Design a protein around this ligand. Structure first.
Ligand code: MG
Ligand code: MG
Ligand code: MG
Ligand code: MG
Ligand code: MG
Ligand code: MG
Ligand code: MG
Ligand code: MG
Ligand code: MG
Ligand code: MG
Ligand code: MG
Ligand code: MG
Length: 120
RNA sequence: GCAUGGUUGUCGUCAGCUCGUGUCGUGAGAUGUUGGGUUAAGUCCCGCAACGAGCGCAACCCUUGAUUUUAGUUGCCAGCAU
């Protein structure tokens, strides 16, 4: 349910393209591809589970960020179901530091949308 | 006219000149404005740590090509007499 459940395609990247900081997270070395300690994955996903417990115990706003082309259906669908927020296309430079300009553009689209339907 | 105001030529109606808020730089600064396409054009698109805006481009002005209403003299003459 936590170790054997995933199985399938849960391997790493090629040996040439790797980060040394991950030496503790590698199980074995396959042909180029590395192998990741699934035993570890369980503990740390449990800590992520508990951290999101603490975060979302109160009414909190969260963002699902994902652009990798094998990601842009999920983040959208569980963000819609969970009612939280997501960015699935490219990340515009400064959506948080320039939150003011981004929300001006949001207000622009929203106002012209009420123009289209609620207005003339 | 080499002390000036005003008026004009020229590149050339060529496509440029900048700002606000963010980020990257010890700093002067940088990015946007670089790259690939497309356009008459910084015209637009796709990329991309930038998101937008302003003066220049374009539009508003004049004329020409089609047509409707209003108006028939000094304009026009079709069906009618001269
Ligand atoms: Mg003289
Ligand atoms: Mg003089
Ligand atoms: Mg002179
Ligand atoms: Mg002289
Ligand atoms: Mg002079
Ligand atoms: Mg002289
Ligand atoms: Mg020049
Ligand atoms: Mg120049
Ligand atoms: Mg320039
Ligand atoms: Mg440059
Ligand atoms: Mg322009
Ligand atoms: Mg013009």
């Amino acid at each position: 349910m936590k170790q054997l459940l995933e199985a399938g395609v849960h391997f790493g990247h090629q040996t040439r393209r790797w980060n040394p900081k991950m030496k503790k997270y590698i199980f074995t070395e396959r042909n180029g591809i590395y192998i990741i300690d699934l035993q570890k994955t369980v503990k740390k996903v449990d800590e992520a589970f508990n951290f999101m417990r603490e975060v979302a115990s109160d009414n909190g706003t969260i963002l699902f960020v994902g652009t990798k082309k094998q990601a842009q259906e999920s983040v959208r669908d569980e963000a819609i179901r969970s009612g939280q927020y997501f960015v699935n296309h490219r990340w515009l430079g400064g959506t948080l530091t320039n939150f003011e300009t981004i929300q001006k553009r949001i207000q622009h689209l929203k106002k012209i949308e009420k123009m289209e339907a609620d207005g003339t």
